Amino acid sequence: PTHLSVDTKFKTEGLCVDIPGIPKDMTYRRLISMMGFKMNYQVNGYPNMFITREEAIRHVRAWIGFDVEGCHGTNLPLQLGFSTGVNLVAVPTPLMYKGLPWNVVRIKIVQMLSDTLKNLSDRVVFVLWAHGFELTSMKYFVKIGPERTCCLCDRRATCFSTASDTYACWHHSIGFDYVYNPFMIDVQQWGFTGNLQSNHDLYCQVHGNAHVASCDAIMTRCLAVHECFVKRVDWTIEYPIIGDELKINAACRKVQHMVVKAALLADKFPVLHDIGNPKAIKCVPQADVEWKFYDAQPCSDKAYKIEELFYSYHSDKFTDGVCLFWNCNVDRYPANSIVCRFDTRVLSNLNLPGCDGGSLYVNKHAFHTPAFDKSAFVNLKQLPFFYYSDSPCESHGIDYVPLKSATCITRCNLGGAVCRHHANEYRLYLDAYNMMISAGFSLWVYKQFDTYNLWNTFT
Ligand SMILES: CN1CCN(c2ncccc2F)CC1=O
Ligand SMILES: [Zn+2]
Ligand SMILES: [Zn+2]
Ligand SMILES: [Zn+2]
Hints:
By secondary structure, the protein is of the alpha/beta class. It has 10 helices and 21 strands. α7 (about 245-265) packs across α10. 4-(3-fluoranylpyridin-2-yl)-1-methyl-piperazin-2-one binds near residues 119, 121, 122, 155 and 242. The PDB classes it as hydrolase/hydrolase inhibitor.
């Protein structure tokens, strides 16, 4: 019930063109042996090179699509393709590299995986659409053995070096030549009818097939991502903290209280329609406004049609007051809205590439977010930075260099000079806002929003 048993059956139909005459009855134990790996009954935390769908989902940050195409079987050169976009050519003697021997190819494989995964995961998961040559070629760049630790640190071992007989994690594997103890999963064992391209092209129109191994590796991991995260959503799975997850979420909550609290003071809306997370709370609990909630889970597939969220017959008058769409992804936002929308294009360790232009955002939980579409925001404008505070000016306590800013909306700045307390709070809030923007989130607001209306709240 925890791992994939080596005695589970492996459907070999998808392997009989590269491997003609392959037995119909086959288990993982025989398949691993067939690949050139003697497991020799080793109870050292590595029960099987292959894993379950649930284990692959728990370790999605490790997924690397892998495909091998025959450029002509120890006679023919192989094209090794990865979801990173790399194409290596191995000779037995998008990045498309020329034909080189296995000893140099295996060195580049360790470099590529270590640079790709060092800040993502403690392992690699080869996501396959197994036809034969990828499983047979693994003996040339993979060495297996008991679970281990890094020679330079305490992280688990993910690489091996024959030159120095030592093991290393993804950070200390410079010059290492073997992938040590990788994991893998064959998507073809999930019961797909038809080939990779047909199943991929059913959900994703963003990846095309140039017939190169990398294109297939991308389509494989994409289709695996769709199956596990787009159409199957398991928000119960927690994920390790691998970066600024805590500061990003703290920043978002701070920005959220700030933007909503200020909009309510500037335009004095009677009602706020909060559309999104069914578990969300009032971000501004002391606000005068009538707060109404609408439940809508994170749409993993496509953005919600505003016509299905509001219409079809709650105040029902969504045009009265302001709508708050905090991370609720809709096709076109109404003009009376405050919106936080995650930009799927952002380059970060928390954002993994998704399906159909979307992205898998892993921050405590995995959220496949649909593609960012700038046209969702035609009735709105980008929210400009500001810091508002109605709190008393009282230091209570962080050194000081006089703060002079137009965007620090406080009583002290109204009356001339900014005080030390609001000056610390301004720089802390500025850092949180910067944290939030860089983490790929974008803020938008109704066109009539003006920060000038906030000075009046000081009388
Ligand atoms: C749980 N886990 C997965 C991710 N992981 C790392 N992530 C980022 C940087 C360095 C790492 F070792 C290693 C680990 O212990
Ligand atoms: Zn290490
Ligand atoms: Zn795709
Ligand atoms: Zn002040």
